[PDB]
Symmetry: D2
Subunit: 299 residues, 4 copies
Amino acid sequence: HHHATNLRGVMAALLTPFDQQQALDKASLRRLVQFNIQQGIDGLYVGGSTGEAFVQSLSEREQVLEIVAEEAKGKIKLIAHVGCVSTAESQQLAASAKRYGFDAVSAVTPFYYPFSFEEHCDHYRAIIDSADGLPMVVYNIPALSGVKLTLDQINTLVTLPGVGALKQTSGDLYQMEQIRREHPDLVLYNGYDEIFASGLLAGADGGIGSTYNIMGWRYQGIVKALKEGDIQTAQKLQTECNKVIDLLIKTGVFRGLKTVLHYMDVVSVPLCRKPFGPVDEKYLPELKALAQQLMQERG
Amino acid sequence: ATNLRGVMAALLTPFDQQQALDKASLRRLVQFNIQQGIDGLYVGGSTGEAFVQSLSEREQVLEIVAEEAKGKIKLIAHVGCVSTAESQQLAASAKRYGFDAVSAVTPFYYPFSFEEHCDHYRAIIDSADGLPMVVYNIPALSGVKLTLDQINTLVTLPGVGALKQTSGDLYQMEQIRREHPDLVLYNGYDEIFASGLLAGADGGIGSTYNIMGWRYQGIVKALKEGDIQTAQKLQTECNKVIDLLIKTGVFRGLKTVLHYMDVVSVPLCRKPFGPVDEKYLPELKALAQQLMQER
Amino acid sequence: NLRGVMAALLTPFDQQQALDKASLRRLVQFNIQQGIDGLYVGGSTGEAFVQSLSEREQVLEIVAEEAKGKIKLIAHVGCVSTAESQQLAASAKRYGFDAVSAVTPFYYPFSFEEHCDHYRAIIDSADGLPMVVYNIPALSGVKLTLDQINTLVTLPGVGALKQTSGDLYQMEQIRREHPDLVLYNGYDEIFASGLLAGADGGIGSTYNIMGWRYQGIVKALKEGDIQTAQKLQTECNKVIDLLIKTGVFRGLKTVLHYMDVVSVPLCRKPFGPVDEKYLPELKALAQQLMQER
Amino acid sequence: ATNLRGVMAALLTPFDQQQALDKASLRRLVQFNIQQGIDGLYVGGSTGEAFVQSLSEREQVLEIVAEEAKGKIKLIAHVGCVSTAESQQLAASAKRYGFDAVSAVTPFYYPFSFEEHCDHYRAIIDSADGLPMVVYNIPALSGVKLTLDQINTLVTLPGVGALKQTSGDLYQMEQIRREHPDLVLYNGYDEIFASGLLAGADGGIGSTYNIMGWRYQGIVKALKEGDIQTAQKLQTECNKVIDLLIKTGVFRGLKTVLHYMDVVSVPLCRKPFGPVDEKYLPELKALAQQLMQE
């Protein structure tokens, strides 16, 4: 619990680049990992939902995990999202994660089927087992999983021996604050980017997100401002993030960020995997507009 | 409507053993919010148990409070009912009693269209005869689930002045604040106050304010001179209290505390609300001594 | 005797949104002739939650003058407030009603225990009338569990469940668990299915236009005329499609306008009027419905 | 696709204690389904624990089923994954084992535009290569809240000859049937099967049919002659079991009953499904004996 103090920070949810055939664009991936590190991001959360995990294989996921150890180990933090519906698939990646040098593992509450809470804790323990002492980030996302944990349940999920943090992809800051109060040293990752500033105020000590792949820096400043006690530009940074977040809801959060990064020239093909479609044409104007904008406010 | 910007207590409505309006306690509770340091009042809301009162009851409360408080603070009158005609009767009555504004929850139970909602609000803003209207939004209890634009359109309606945002979505809070720079934006849920501010609210209307509304102005102060640590500490001490209220049942809890603060005489809510569980009293009893000693 | 096809009465208003007594009366009659086993008085469909207690009492009385000893009359006295529900109940007794009803009190979060008392007080104030416990999650948000349902349908004084839920598994667990219990289908649109899983009746809105069509669904099922039921239900749903699109209450009131029963087809504000463009179909529908019976 | 009409068992996938596919108990469970009265089997669906298998495992299951059942009865391959191409791979495979029908769940987890679903269902029809498709809808587990128009646009995509309707909204079932007199219409919730047939459904695909598909076939029958009273008794007894199988957990519960009837060797579901509770064994045991006789 205390051992996980380091896992604190702003961590990007790495996208997975794909080629004209839907295959892993291995080259574009390699670039993106850099694009991220030169932004000054604290760490990368690899193979999560943003990372398109669920339209890939145990193998394909493992290539990414690997192709990212070669690059980003030692320098920044690496959390490996090893989560599948199957517990055994999860432990395969947890051990592949231990192998490849990773700093922590993480798993989405398994989904589609309605598992009990006892079943949920057994899923997690077994992935920790196979983690061979790597920290666990329990990954909580009701919107998309369909899972609905009480407070007490969530309290129990994070005091399992080997649990080090919480991805809280939830909009409830009453709960976010209740979690802090309860576990005063827990590493509490804000998960919805549209409310980072707000989540930090309730007891977060960092976050994870997908938008960082194109404007990471904005999020670090918000942390700085709060440390400082400068409530004013903190809100300027939240506010500008959501004008981008606003547009990435309109286009498609993944195919938007990728159709951006194609303009920043870090992706040969901005595609997501089927069944996800191509971005609609008329956004290209503004998408082209946003890459062009974002490159200059950094440099 | 900067006059409306503020920490407004959602006034509770006192009853007696026989479930009758307790006007002694109404008046005291009104004074105990003045002396406490509140910017204003929001009378006859959900928190005031509006929907277990008759119109005549909601009128006698309005009248008393303007009697005790007009000129002394801002007063908003929640005049909302499911019926437009009931709602207008109360708008007229609020205007009569000298109120600064009126408010009305989205009308509920039956499905109404968004056009029908707006006409509801047009009709009310009119019987209100010049009072500016606070649109009242509480989706979890109303069951009305408004989009963003729809909410942009309700707030530009003729003679709408403010939005009570009783929502937990601090993304939508920002999108309103960023799209209506001037708008008086009230935070609804007491437990995200600090963060609702950050997201872009300029104040709040809240039920627990009735017992520790300094702690929420104390939140506002703390945030304005960048003392995050006192602010978070407050919210935290607010939620500590909100955790107990959520367990005891919030209105009856809140009243039972004022019953130990000697303000309210019978700590009842109306049937079918029940009494507070006898087991919770020492914790409420000593929340009050605790709280009386902080003020 | 509470068992049957029991039409949820609409409250016809005049051009000033006041109780159109003549039409009210014309609708009691216009229903009475359809075969309907009874009329459900002052429920949601009766626009009750946009009337004062007086106006609701006004209806209970008028109707009970047009109807008592002829058909079954059920009085929905439910408000959010227990005291107010109690009043409408004692009235329903005075006017000599067959049963009272009371939808789970809504808006505020009440405990199931708190609910239970609500009904205990209303069963006392109805002074020996039986209660129709009136479930409706969609509109009230009250999300009842089977176990909670089980105690409520066996509170001493209660005698029936208005099961306004499209969950036909739960219908059967209830028929199973209380084999005698009277239990009304609430969705007009799954009535056929609902008797199949074990409702033995319906309290419904759209019965005000076609009680017989529903009655003849009950016939066919009873008579194993499975082909018939469907045919009917399908024509009973081709309307419900229409009415859902029109505005339902207004839709029905209008149809009763083009049937010469209701002088002015209006609901109270905030329900506005029926769009103009849907008047032809409603008129055609009206003039297709008088043909049958 | 009128030939696809009927009561189909949603096939369970037997596993051993290593969580490896138990191939001798698969074939047995297939033979037990055939011997039982079934019109056909629906393979590697949610009931088949699809979403905890790999593509390989899903393919090896199918193969065993088509070796054992093709010709004899009707065969539907649930080839649905989140990814279109994985569905596409399972699709062609499904055709190599000479299946009658292909199926796929509306892709889940990520929110997909309706358009993006329609294409997905086309790409799988292409690969199905002449095998009809069974649009499989199940809002409760998928979180995909399809409307009426949307659904009508699906089931008229060219190639689609069935809808699996695992939605408990029997008004929607009538609208779909009123609009589509010839569409095969599989009831998906076993606990409202009678009521769903009355609403429109002419077929069924379900998990409980693995232990009492004859009861379900009798409902179709009972109904069609106009014997409501037995349809009723049947559905009420079908429902008595589901009460049971919900308490224990449904797949494992069923795997247990199936174990007692000498069909499945090890009644395990793949983690994170837990084992069934020891306390429920008496009654689960007791249910098997009841059903073998009946």
